[PDB]
């Protein structure tokens, strides 16, 4: 959208952030009382790899290798633990101009045993104003 052009462009993408958690019937040697799996995915299995470079999951410092990196679908990390925490998620885009990444702070929370397992869903909408034509291609093949 330069002044002497008549068109402009706006494309919106939907991402789903979520996790599942259930009490391990059998604790771990270290005392991890739960098993949880957190993911970043696109609604109805539409391939977001067209425009996603990689997803980075920053785990609490109590995990070994807390910076978990997912360069290819599915974008998830399966772990075990004992308490709920905030997990920040970075999504890096196949784009040569900023916007390059977006961060979300995800609430990884665990239910007590004797309560149902957690399956939690967060849907997030992102809006790209006048993207480059090559990134607009990627965005709109998904």
């Amino acid at each position: 959208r330069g002044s002497h052009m008549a068109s402009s462009c706006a494309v919106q993408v939907k991402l789903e952030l979520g996790h599942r958690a259930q009490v391990r019937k059998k604790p771990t040697v270290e005392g991890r009382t739960h098993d949880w799996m957190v993911f970043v995915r696109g609604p109805e299995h539409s391939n977001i790899q067209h425009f996603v470079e990689k997803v980075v999951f920053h785990l609490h410092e109590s995990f070994p290798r807390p910076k978990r990196v997912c360069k290819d679908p599915p974008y998830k990390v399966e772990e075990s633990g004992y308490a709920g925490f905030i997990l920040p998620i970075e999504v890096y885009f196949k784009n040569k101009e900023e916007p390059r990444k977006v961060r979300f702070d995800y609430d990884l929370f665990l239910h007590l045993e004797g309560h149902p397992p957690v399956n939690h869903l967060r849907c997030e909408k992102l809006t790209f104003n006048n993207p480059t034509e090559d990134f607009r291609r990627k965005l709109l093949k998904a």
């Binding site: 009382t33 004992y82 308490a83 709920g84 925490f85 929370f109 007590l112 309560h115």
Partner: peptide, 8 residues
């Protein structure tokens, strides 16, 4: 409440 302790 129904969820567990949280760490930080």
């Amino acid at each position: 409440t129904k969820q567990t302790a949280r760490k930080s």
